[PDB]
Amino acid sequence: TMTDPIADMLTRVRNANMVRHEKLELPASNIKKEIAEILKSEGFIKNVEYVEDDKQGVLRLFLKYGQNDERVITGLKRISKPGLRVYAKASEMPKVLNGLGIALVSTSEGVITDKEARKRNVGGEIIAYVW
Amino acid sequence: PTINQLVRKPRQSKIKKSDSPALNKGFNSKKKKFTDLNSPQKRGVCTRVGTMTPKKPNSALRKYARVRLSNNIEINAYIPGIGHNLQEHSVVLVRGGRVKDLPGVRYHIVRGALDTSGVDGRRQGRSLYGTKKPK
RNA sequence: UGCAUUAGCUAGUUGGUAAGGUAACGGCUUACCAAGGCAACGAUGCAUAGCCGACCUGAGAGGGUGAUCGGCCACACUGGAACUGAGACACGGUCCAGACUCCUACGGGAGGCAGCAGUAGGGAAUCUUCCGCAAUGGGCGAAAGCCUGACGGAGCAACGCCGCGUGAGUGAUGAAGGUCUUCGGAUCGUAAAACUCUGUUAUUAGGGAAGAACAUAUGUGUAAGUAACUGUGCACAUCUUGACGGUACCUAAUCAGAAAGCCACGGCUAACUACGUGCCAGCAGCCGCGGUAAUACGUAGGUGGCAAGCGUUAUCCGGAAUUAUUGGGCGUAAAGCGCGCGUAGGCGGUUUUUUAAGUCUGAUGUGAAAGCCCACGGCUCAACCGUGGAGGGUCAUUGGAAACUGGAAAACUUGAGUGCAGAAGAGGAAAGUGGAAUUCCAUGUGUAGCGGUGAAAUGCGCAGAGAUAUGGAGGAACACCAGUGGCGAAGGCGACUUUCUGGUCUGUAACUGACGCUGAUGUGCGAAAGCGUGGGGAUCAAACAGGAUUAGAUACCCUGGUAGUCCACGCCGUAAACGAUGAGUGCUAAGUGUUAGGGGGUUUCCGCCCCUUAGUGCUGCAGCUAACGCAUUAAGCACUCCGCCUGG
RNA sequence: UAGGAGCUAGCCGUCGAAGGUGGGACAAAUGAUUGGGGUGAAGUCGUAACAAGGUAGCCGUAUCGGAAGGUGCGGCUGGAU
């Protein structure tokens, strides 16, 4: 159900930030935590705290929100399943919403990121529409 | 509806019903064929006018027309105008329209085609005809 | 090719080896190969087909677009054999069938519109049995020629327009002008006569003219020059040339000259109120009006929106994304499944890691017209034409490499699969708990209406109908356990001792590694009305009887009673089976008392307090739709599938 | 004599549009034929249902009905009393 934490856990989190619940948990991962690490570095939240267990353990979350009790989590989504993924390459990739959007990241040629490849001509990957 | 198991049928819009069988009909008389080629030139024959013993309350005293053009095929149409020579054996042409205070009737018969009368009672709507087109 | 209210398709078949023959190559036929091969990739078969651009155009997405118009196939009286031109089944080739045509003097001969016009014809539409090769064109031909019905032209045209079109306002507002009068002079009006300003288009009459040049046409002679001047190219240059032009350009000849209609005068239709107009005629678009006060029917001087102007007809779209990845939902509304149970699948949770195959190719040769950027020329503006760059910045061509993947090596675990109490079990069934009045009363009787009933008669009434019990039996048929409870695929599931306690079920869950929902498979039934045997008229029960309301039955009424009712052998695929609301991962402030199963404290005297979930209900946050109203358990929220329908 | 093999003159099997035969399929007229709806005052029936439509009852459902209507058995609220 959690291809993305924004898939099913957001059912909890979208209210949890309405009620200022600024810390939560997540399945253990390295790319999933990486993208949230990008977002917390951008300053969405405080920080991606780390895993307690090894295999699908609880990565801690620590969700800061807007000082005005605002939330710019404008939807993030994916379709991963054995049967649905990208057997397919960002040797070129464009952007949407004039660079405000920043979201999921997955490929294989040479390490940059979604927003860290906006200028490369070997781009990244964007899903969300932030503004 | 899904997308990946939607490959067996796309998620799309819908289709058309029947509309005006006479506007776009033809006829091939070679081998009892029945054709269609989308022309306003399709004909009939001048038969009838009347009604029958009511059940519903629609009040109107105006001319009915089972009345049509050269080659016979039975329809239900309208004869516009009061002065008319449409009793039997007439040929005409037809266009569309409905003037108010007329129940449900929705076509016409053009004036002065082969075998009909002309328009008399309207003198302020004067300068029509648009093609042989002076002032 | 598209299409199952077109499905099981096919048989030297499934197209190598040997013989054969295509410039090439074969089951193309033959000695061998398997019944194979083809499959709801809807093969088979039906329908259809010359194909692209073409246009219009939805916000972009990008697309439907063939008439023309361009390109690319096939056919040229149909057909069949052969010949053939290198190739032909030949737009104007033989034999022909065929078919008709004509001829016939009969003896036999053939013809032969799909070149392009018009012929009969038609139409809304195709000109005109149009011009000539003038030019250009090409096939054969030095030279030269023709075909031209190629080519270009001549007419046709709001099919659709276009510039000019309608030029001058000054002095009496009244020199003259009248929809609507209990008229005031304003008045369609310094408009108006007569023209301030004038001489374009307007017709015009010819000087006429360009265009009218291209193509050779002449040896003077050059190049090829062959042994060399030469025939052709041609420096000469003899000056041609219209399918068009004594017309254009021009004098200005010309004069305020030779050139403008719509629904209405209806709210929305802005076009004024009126009369014959009294829902009549009839104008009549959303909708009207009209009935003695029509604005409106009819009519009108103006009169309105734009002018070669006026309204429609078939197509697409604006309208209206009211047609939805982009840009629809499905309770009611356009739509959400008695149902659930199921294989492929769609999607089921992943945590690491390698490739460069795709995830705005690098940069360029690089790009279809009415259609990728600008420059253009002509267009009376236009009407419409074309031209170059940009050739793109759009394909090809070169690239290899994240934090997904296809591929490659590991494991993990929520969506999957292995203890437990077995509580309730009505899941759905397996043995017991082992039988009466109502049917006669034989013991015994005692009576007229029991009755059917609104009230009554019928049925029942004399063994004396209904009667009595030790006694004399059974015909259809075995209500505890009582709240907002437990189960099945459902219809549904009810006596209990029991069953499997299957399964729910919560406390433990002892554990390998995605092992599931919906969905090809397939799963079963679904209640009754009715449903294929004894019962069954025993009860109930239609029908009948027989009764009658108050001023009405045979009906509300029904015993006798027609079946039927009903159980020991066959079910349908229907109910308000309704959740009008399909079934997986999880929440939506949450609360709520509680069945189950647990942790328990306190143990109570089996109870008070806390955590608890499948639910149980109750409300209640968000959300929800128009509101009905739904909601921690949808009529919400983010990841699964299903089907429905976007007019009915 | 080509007589041998040969092809035309002669004999053994082939398809051919063609040609005409045959039973189905579709039609179209329609038959002194013939079923569904609508339609035009509904004269036919009460306002039958909507005010418990005059009696809340309903849904599958024997049932007859020129037409609004009715009686049988399983699930139901879509109800004033």
Short mmCIF file of N, CA and C (backbone and C1' of nucleotides) in Angstrom, two decimals, chain C residues 512-567:
data_model
loop_
_atom_site.label_atom_id
_atom_site.label_comp_id
_atom_site.label_asym_id
_atom_site.label_seq_id
_atom_site.Cartn_x
_atom_site.Cartn_y
_atom_site.Cartn_z
P U C 512 11.67 -19.50 10.05
"O5'" U C 512 11.57 -20.26 8.65
"C5'" U C 512 12.23 -19.75 7.50
"C4'" U C 512 11.57 -20.21 6.22
"C3'" U C 512 11.71 -19.26 5.03
"O3'" U C 512 12.85 -19.58 4.25
"C1'" U C 512 9.42 -19.91 5.33
P G C 513 13.69 -18.46 3.47
"O5'" G C 513 12.59 -17.51 2.83
"C5'" G C 513 12.61 -17.16 1.44
"C4'" G C 513 11.23 -16.84 0.94
"C3'" G C 513 11.04 -15.44 0.35
"O3'" G C 513 9.97 -15.48 -0.60
"C1'" G C 513 9.71 -15.66 2.28
P A C 514 9.67 -14.23 -1.59
"O5'" A C 514 8.08 -14.29 -1.80
"C5'" A C 514 7.45 -13.54 -2.84
"C4'" A C 514 5.94 -13.50 -2.66
"C3'" A C 514 5.15 -12.72 -3.73
"O3'" A C 514 3.86 -13.31 -3.87
"C1'" A C 514 4.75 -11.77 -1.64
P C C 515 3.41 -14.06 -5.22
"O5'" C C 515 1.84 -14.34 -5.05
"C5'" C C 515 1.23 -14.52 -3.77
"C4'" C C 515 1.48 -15.90 -3.21
"C3'" C C 515 0.76 -16.26 -1.91
"O3'" C C 515 -0.47 -16.98 -2.08
"C1'" C C 515 3.10 -16.81 -1.78
P G C 516 -1.79 -16.42 -2.81
"O5'" G C 516 -2.42 -15.33 -1.81
"C5'" G C 516 -3.84 -15.23 -1.65
"C4'" G C 516 -4.27 -13.83 -1.25
"C3'" G C 516 -5.48 -13.25 -2.00
"O3'" G C 516 -6.71 -13.47 -1.32
"C1'" G C 516 -3.63 -11.83 -2.27
P C C 517 -8.13 -13.14 -2.02
"O5'" C C 517 -8.40 -11.58 -1.74
"C5'" C C 517 -9.73 -11.06 -1.73
"C4'" C C 517 -9.83 -9.68 -2.35
"C3'" C C 517 -10.58 -9.59 -3.67
"O3'" C C 517 -11.99 -9.50 -3.52
"C1'" C C 517 -8.51 -8.51 -3.89
P U C 518 -12.98 -10.57 -4.21
"O5'" U C 518 -13.41 -9.90 -5.60
"C5'" U C 518 -13.82 -8.54 -5.68
"C4'" U C 518 -13.19 -7.84 -6.86
"C3'" U C 518 -13.46 -8.46 -8.23
"O3'" U C 518 -14.68 -8.02 -8.78
"C1'" U C 518 -11.14 -8.08 -7.97
P G C 519 -15.35 -8.78 -10.03
"O5'" G C 519 -14.24 -8.72 -11.17
"C5'" G C 519 -14.36 -9.50 -12.35
"C4'" G C 519 -13.04 -9.63 -13.06
"C3'" G C 519 -12.77 -10.97 -13.72
"O3'" G C 519 -13.33 -11.09 -15.01
"C1'" G C 519 -10.98 -10.46 -12.31
P A C 520 -14.05 -12.46 -15.42
"O5'" A C 520 -12.94 -13.56 -15.10
"C5'" A C 520 -11.71 -13.59 -15.81
"C4'" A C 520 -11.89 -14.23 -17.15
"C3'" A C 520 -12.62 -15.57 -17.14
"O3'" A C 520 -14.03 -15.41 -17.08
"C1'" A C 520 -10.68 -15.71 -18.50
P U C 521 -14.89 -16.13 -15.93
"O5'" U C 521 -14.17 -17.54 -15.73
"C5'" U C 521 -14.40 -18.59 -16.64
"C4'" U C 521 -13.18 -19.46 -16.83
"C3'" U C 521 -13.39 -20.96 -16.71
"O3'" U C 521 -13.99 -21.52 -17.87
"C1'" U C 521 -11.39 -20.32 -15.62
P G C 522 -15.48 -22.12 -17.80
"O5'" G C 522 -15.32 -23.38 -16.83
"C5'" G C 522 -16.32 -23.72 -15.88
"C4'" G C 522 -15.71 -23.91 -14.51
"C3'" G C 522 -16.68 -23.85 -13.34
"O3'" G C 522 -17.35 -25.07 -13.11
"C1'" G C 522 -14.83 -22.47 -12.89
P U C 523 -18.80 -25.07 -12.43
"O5'" U C 523 -18.55 -24.43 -10.99
"C5'" U C 523 -17.82 -25.14 -10.00
"C4'" U C 523 -18.14 -24.66 -8.61
"C3'" U C 523 -19.60 -24.34 -8.32
"O3'" U C 523 -20.34 -25.50 -7.99
"C1'" U C 523 -18.29 -22.54 -7.63
P G C 524 -20.79 -26.51 -9.16
"O5'" G C 524 -22.23 -26.99 -8.70
"C5'" G C 524 -23.32 -26.08 -8.71
"C4'" G C 524 -23.60 -25.55 -7.33
"C3'" G C 524 -24.83 -24.68 -7.22
"O3'" G C 524 -26.03 -25.43 -7.22
"C1'" G C 524 -23.07 -23.58 -6.20
P C C 525 -26.94 -25.53 -8.55
"O5'" C C 525 -28.38 -25.08 -8.06
"C5'" C C 525 -28.93 -25.62 -6.87
"C4'" C C 525 -28.78 -24.68 -5.72
"C3'" C C 525 -29.83 -23.59 -5.59
"O3'" C C 525 -31.01 -24.07 -4.96
"C1'" C C 525 -27.68 -22.65 -5.31
P G C 526 -32.46 -23.61 -5.48
"O5'" G C 526 -32.52 -22.05 -5.14
"C5'" G C 526 -32.73 -21.62 -3.80
"C4'" G C 526 -32.76 -20.12 -3.68
"C3'" G C 526 -33.71 -19.37 -4.59
"O3'" G C 526 -35.03 -19.36 -4.09
"C1'" G C 526 -31.59 -18.30 -4.56
P A C 527 -36.05 -20.55 -4.41
"O5'" A C 527 -36.29 -21.29 -3.02
"C5'" A C 527 -35.80 -20.78 -1.79
"C4'" A C 527 -36.69 -19.73 -1.19
"C3'" A C 527 -38.15 -19.76 -1.59
"O3'" A C 527 -38.88 -20.79 -0.95
"C1'" A C 527 -37.36 -17.52 -1.55
P A C 528 -39.64 -21.93 -1.80
"O5'" A C 528 -41.12 -21.88 -1.23
"C5'" A C 528 -42.22 -21.49 -2.04
"C4'" A C 528 -42.58 -20.04 -1.84
"C3'" A C 528 -43.68 -19.52 -2.75
"O3'" A C 528 -44.97 -19.83 -2.27
"C1'" A C 528 -41.86 -18.01 -2.77
P A C 529 -45.96 -20.76 -3.13
"O5'" A C 529 -46.35 -19.83 -4.36
"C5'" A C 529 -47.71 -19.52 -4.65
"C4'" A C 529 -47.81 -18.54 -5.78
"C3'" A C 529 -47.95 -19.17 -7.16
"O3'" A C 529 -49.30 -19.48 -7.47
"C1'" A C 529 -46.23 -17.55 -7.21
P G C 530 -49.80 -21.00 -7.54
"O5'" G C 530 -48.66 -21.76 -8.35
"C5'" G C 530 -48.69 -21.79 -9.77
"C4'" G C 530 -47.31 -21.90 -10.36
"C3'" G C 530 -46.70 -23.29 -10.42
"O3'" G C 530 -47.22 -24.09 -11.46
"C1'" G C 530 -45.08 -21.72 -9.73
P C C 531 -47.03 -25.68 -11.41
"O5'" C C 531 -45.49 -25.88 -11.07
"C5'" C C 531 -44.50 -25.82 -12.09
"C4'" C C 531 -43.18 -26.34 -11.62
"C3'" C C 531 -43.23 -27.66 -10.88
"O3'" C C 531 -43.35 -28.75 -11.77
"C1'" C C 531 -41.84 -26.18 -9.70
P G C 532 -44.79 -29.35 -12.14
"O5'" G C 532 -44.59 -30.92 -11.95
"C5'" G C 532 -44.87 -31.85 -13.00
"C4'" G C 532 -43.73 -32.81 -13.21
"C3'" G C 532 -43.51 -33.86 -12.13
"O3'" G C 532 -44.46 -34.92 -12.07
"C1'" G C 532 -41.47 -32.87 -12.56
P U C 533 -45.32 -35.08 -10.71
"O5'" U C 533 -45.76 -36.62 -10.62
"C5'" U C 533 -46.64 -37.05 -9.59
"C4'" U C 533 -46.19 -38.33 -8.94
"C3'" U C 533 -46.84 -38.68 -7.60
"O3'" U C 533 -48.09 -39.36 -7.74
"C1'" U C 533 -44.48 -38.88 -7.41
P G C 534 -49.37 -39.02 -6.82
"O5'" G C 534 -49.54 -40.29 -5.87
"C5'" G C 534 -50.53 -40.32 -4.85
"C4'" G C 534 -50.12 -41.14 -3.64
"C3'" G C 534 -50.39 -40.49 -2.29
"O3'" G C 534 -51.68 -40.77 -1.78
"C1'" G C 534 -48.13 -41.02 -2.42
P G C 535 -52.96 -39.94 -2.27
"O5'" G C 535 -53.85 -39.81 -0.95
"C5'" G C 535 -53.71 -38.70 -0.08
"C4'" G C 535 -52.45 -38.76 0.75
"C3'" G C 535 -52.25 -37.60 1.70
"O3'" G C 535 -52.93 -37.71 2.94
"C1'" G C 535 -50.26 -37.95 0.49
P G C 536 -54.23 -36.81 3.25
"O5'" G C 536 -53.71 -35.35 3.69
"C5'" G C 536 -52.73 -34.57 2.99
"C4'" G C 536 -53.35 -33.51 2.13
"C3'" G C 536 -54.77 -33.79 1.66
"O3'" G C 536 -55.74 -33.55 2.65
"C1'" G C 536 -53.50 -32.98 -0.14
P G C 537 -57.24 -34.08 2.45
"O5'" G C 537 -58.14 -32.99 3.19
"C5'" G C 537 -57.85 -31.60 3.12
"C4'" G C 537 -58.92 -30.85 2.37
"C3'" G C 537 -60.23 -31.59 2.09
"O3'" G C 537 -61.15 -31.55 3.17
"C1'" G C 537 -59.41 -30.71 0.08
P A C 538 -61.27 -32.80 4.17
"O5'" A C 538 -59.93 -32.74 5.00
"C5'" A C 538 -59.44 -33.87 5.71
"C4'" A C 538 -58.81 -33.45 7.01
"C3'" A C 538 -58.56 -31.95 7.15
"O3'" A C 538 -59.73 -31.23 7.49
"C1'" A C 538 -56.62 -33.12 7.78
P U C 539 -60.07 -29.84 6.75
"O5'" U C 539 -59.19 -28.78 7.55
"C5'" U C 539 -59.29 -28.66 8.96
"C4'" U C 539 -58.26 -27.71 9.49
"C3'" U C 539 -58.23 -26.35 8.82
"O3'" U C 539 -59.15 -25.43 9.40
"C1'" U C 539 -56.06 -27.27 8.81
P C C 540 -60.24 -24.69 8.48
"O5'" C C 540 -59.38 -23.63 7.66
"C5'" C C 540 -58.56 -22.68 8.33
"C4'" C C 540 -57.50 -22.12 7.41
"C3'" C C 540 -58.02 -21.56 6.09
"O3'" C C 540 -58.43 -20.21 6.21
"C1'" C C 540 -56.22 -23.05 5.68
P A C 541 -59.72 -19.68 5.43
"O5'" A C 541 -59.51 -20.25 3.96
"C5'" A C 541 -58.56 -19.66 3.08
"C4'" A C 541 -58.63 -20.26 1.70
"C3'" A C 541 -60.01 -20.60 1.19
"O3'" A C 541 -60.78 -19.47 0.81
"C1'" A C 541 -58.56 -22.38 0.70
P A C 542 -62.38 -19.55 0.90
"O5'" A C 542 -62.75 -20.47 -0.34
"C5'" A C 542 -62.94 -19.92 -1.64
"C4'" A C 542 -61.73 -19.15 -2.13
"C3'" A C 542 -61.93 -18.41 -3.44
"O3'" A C 542 -62.58 -17.16 -3.28
"C1'" A C 542 -59.91 -19.62 -3.53
P A C 543 -64.17 -16.98 -3.46
"O5'" A C 543 -64.58 -18.11 -4.51
"C5'" A C 543 -64.18 -18.01 -5.87
"C4'" A C 543 -64.75 -19.12 -6.71
"C3'" A C 543 -66.18 -19.52 -6.42
"O3'" A C 543 -67.12 -18.58 -6.89
"C1'" A C 543 -64.88 -21.45 -6.75
P C C 544 -68.13 -17.86 -5.85
"O5'" C C 544 -69.26 -18.95 -5.64
"C5'" C C 544 -69.96 -19.46 -6.77
"C4'" C C 544 -70.48 -20.85 -6.53
"C3'" C C 544 -71.28 -21.05 -5.25
"O3'" C C 544 -72.61 -20.58 -5.36
"C1'" C C 544 -69.72 -22.79 -5.46
P A C 545 -73.24 -19.62 -4.23
"O5'" A C 545 -74.74 -20.15 -4.07
"C5'" A C 545 -75.06 -21.53 -4.14
"C4'" A C 545 -74.97 -22.21 -2.80
"C3'" A C 545 -75.45 -21.42 -1.59
"O3'" A C 545 -76.84 -21.61 -1.39
"C1'" A C 545 -73.48 -22.71 -1.11
P G C 546 -77.89 -20.41 -1.49
"O5'" G C 546 -78.64 -20.42 -0.08
"C5'" G C 546 -78.09 -21.06 1.07
"C4'" G C 546 -77.41 -20.06 1.97
"C3'" G C 546 -77.50 -18.62 1.55
"O3'" G C 546 -78.76 -18.04 1.79
"C1'" G C 546 -75.31 -19.07 2.24
P G C 547 -79.18 -16.69 1.02
"O5'" G C 547 -79.48 -15.63 2.17
"C5'" G C 547 -79.64 -16.01 3.54
"C4'" G C 547 -78.60 -15.36 4.41
"C3'" G C 547 -78.38 -13.87 4.20
"O3'" G C 547 -79.39 -13.09 4.81
"C1'" G C 547 -76.30 -14.99 4.46
P A C 548 -80.82 -12.89 4.10
"O5'" A C 548 -81.28 -11.43 4.54
"C5'" A C 548 -80.82 -10.27 3.87
"C4'" A C 548 -79.63 -9.68 4.58
"C3'" A C 548 -78.98 -8.48 3.90
"O3'" A C 548 -79.66 -7.27 4.18
"C1'" A C 548 -77.33 -10.04 4.52
P U C 549 -79.19 -5.89 3.50
"O5'" U C 549 -78.60 -5.04 4.71
"C5'" U C 549 -79.20 -5.06 6.00
"C4'" U C 549 -78.20 -4.66 7.06
"C3'" U C 549 -77.94 -3.17 7.16
"O3'" U C 549 -77.55 -2.83 8.49
"C1'" U C 549 -75.98 -4.25 6.41
P U C 550 -78.39 -1.80 9.39
"O5'" U C 550 -79.79 -1.65 8.66
"C5'" U C 550 -80.57 -0.48 8.80
"C4'" U C 550 -80.23 0.55 7.75
"C3'" U C 550 -81.21 0.68 6.59
"O3'" U C 550 -82.36 1.43 6.91
"C1'" U C 550 -78.95 0.78 5.81
P A C 551 -83.68 1.32 5.98
"O5'" A C 551 -83.12 1.25 4.49
"C5'" A C 551 -83.97 0.86 3.42
"C4'" A C 551 -83.28 0.82 2.07
"C3'" A C 551 -81.85 0.26 2.06
"O3'" A C 551 -81.66 -0.57 0.91
"C1'" A C 551 -81.89 2.39 1.04
P G C 552 -81.47 -2.17 1.03
"O5'" G C 552 -80.13 -2.49 0.22
"C5'" G C 552 -79.45 -3.72 0.39
"C4'" G C 552 -78.48 -4.00 -0.74
"C3'" G C 552 -77.27 -4.86 -0.40
"O3'" G C 552 -77.56 -6.25 -0.39
"C1'" G C 552 -76.61 -3.00 -1.73
P A C 553 -76.39 -7.33 -0.17
"O5'" A C 553 -75.90 -7.70 -1.64
"C5'" A C 553 -76.72 -8.48 -2.52
"C4'" A C 553 -75.93 -9.57 -3.18
"C3'" A C 553 -75.46 -10.70 -2.26
"O3'" A C 553 -75.50 -11.95 -2.94
"C1'" A C 553 -73.59 -9.71 -3.30
P U C 554 -75.56 -13.32 -2.10
"O5'" U C 554 -74.44 -14.24 -2.75
"C5'" U C 554 -73.92 -15.38 -2.06
"C4'" U C 554 -72.48 -15.63 -2.42
"C3'" U C 554 -71.51 -14.51 -2.07
"O3'" U C 554 -70.23 -15.06 -1.78
"C1'" U C 554 -71.55 -14.80 -4.41
P A C 555 -69.07 -14.16 -1.14
"O5'" A C 555 -68.70 -13.15 -2.32
"C5'" A C 555 -67.38 -13.02 -2.83
"C4'" A C 555 -66.83 -11.66 -2.52
"C3'" A C 555 -66.43 -11.42 -1.08
"O3'" A C 555 -65.14 -11.93 -0.79
"C1'" A C 555 -67.76 -9.62 -1.82
P C C 556 -64.76 -12.32 0.72
"O5'" C C 556 -64.76 -10.92 1.48
"C5'" C C 556 -63.73 -9.97 1.28
"C4'" C C 556 -63.57 -9.08 2.48
"C3'" C C 556 -63.64 -9.78 3.83
"O3'" C C 556 -62.40 -10.35 4.23
"C1'" C C 556 -65.07 -7.91 3.85
P C C 557 -62.19 -11.94 4.27
"O5'" C C 557 -63.62 -12.55 4.63
"C5'" C C 557 -64.26 -12.29 5.87
"C4'" C C 557 -65.30 -13.33 6.17
"C3'" C C 557 -65.42 -14.47 5.18
"O3'" C C 557 -64.43 -15.45 5.39
"C1'" C C 557 -67.58 -13.71 5.83
P C C 558 -63.40 -15.87 4.23
"O5'" C C 558 -62.97 -17.34 4.66
"C5'" C C 558 -63.07 -17.75 6.01
"C4'" C C 558 -64.34 -18.53 6.25
"C3'" C C 558 -64.43 -19.85 5.50
"O3'" C C 558 -63.80 -20.90 6.21
"C1'" C C 558 -66.50 -18.63 5.37
P U C 559 -63.43 -22.29 5.49
"O5'" U C 559 -64.32 -23.38 6.23
"C5'" U C 559 -63.95 -23.95 7.48
"C4'" U C 559 -65.13 -24.69 8.06
"C3'" U C 559 -65.61 -25.87 7.21
"O3'" U C 559 -65.06 -27.10 7.66
"C1'" U C 559 -67.41 -24.35 7.58
P G C 560 -64.52 -28.19 6.61
"O5'" G C 560 -65.81 -28.59 5.76
"C5'" G C 560 -66.74 -29.54 6.24
"C4'" G C 560 -67.64 -30.06 5.15
"C3'" G C 560 -66.98 -30.34 3.81
"O3'" G C 560 -66.30 -31.58 3.77
"C1'" G C 560 -68.86 -29.03 3.42
P G C 561 -64.74 -31.60 3.42
"O5'" G C 561 -64.68 -30.94 1.97
"C5'" G C 561 -65.55 -31.38 0.94
"C4'" G C 561 -65.72 -30.31 -0.10
"C3'" G C 561 -64.43 -29.92 -0.78
"O3'" G C 561 -64.15 -30.80 -1.83
"C1'" G C 561 -65.56 -27.98 -0.07
P U C 562 -62.64 -31.18 -2.17
"O5'" U C 562 -62.65 -31.16 -3.76
"C5'" U C 562 -63.40 -30.16 -4.42
"C4'" U C 562 -62.62 -29.58 -5.57
"C3'" U C 562 -61.16 -29.28 -5.30
"O3'" U C 562 -60.31 -30.42 -5.34
"C1'" U C 562 -62.13 -27.39 -6.23
P A C 563 -59.64 -31.00 -3.99
"O5'" A C 563 -58.12 -31.25 -4.37
"C5'" A C 563 -57.75 -31.61 -5.68
"C4'" A C 563 -57.25 -30.41 -6.44
"C3'" A C 563 -55.90 -29.88 -6.01
"O3'" A C 563 -54.82 -30.65 -6.51
"C1'" A C 563 -57.40 -28.08 -6.39
P G C 564 -53.51 -30.88 -5.62
"O5'" G C 564 -53.13 -29.40 -5.16
"C5'" G C 564 -52.59 -28.48 -6.08
"C4'" G C 564 -52.36 -27.13 -5.44
"C3'" G C 564 -51.64 -27.18 -4.11
"O3'" G C 564 -50.24 -27.19 -4.29
"C1'" G C 564 -53.58 -25.85 -3.91
P U C 565 -49.33 -28.16 -3.41
"O5'" U C 565 -49.40 -27.50 -1.96
"C5'" U C 565 -49.11 -26.12 -1.79
"C4'" U C 565 -49.49 -25.63 -0.42
"C3'" U C 565 -49.27 -26.58 0.75
"O3'" U C 565 -47.93 -26.60 1.26
"C1'" U C 565 -51.43 -25.64 0.89
P C C 566 -46.64 -26.54 0.30
"O5'" C C 566 -45.44 -27.05 1.22
"C5'" C C 566 -45.54 -27.06 2.64
"C4'" C C 566 -46.00 -28.41 3.15
"C3'" C C 566 -45.39 -29.63 2.47
"O3'" C C 566 -44.10 -29.93 2.98
"C1'" C C 566 -47.74 -29.93 2.83
P C C 567 -42.77 -29.25 2.38
"O5'" C C 567 -41.69 -30.43 2.40
"C5'" C C 567 -41.12 -30.92 3.61
"C4'" C C 567 -41.74 -32.22 4.07
"C3'" C C 567 -41.28 -33.49 3.36
"O3'" C C 567 -40.07 -34.00 3.90
"C1'" C C 567 -43.64 -33.47 3.50
#
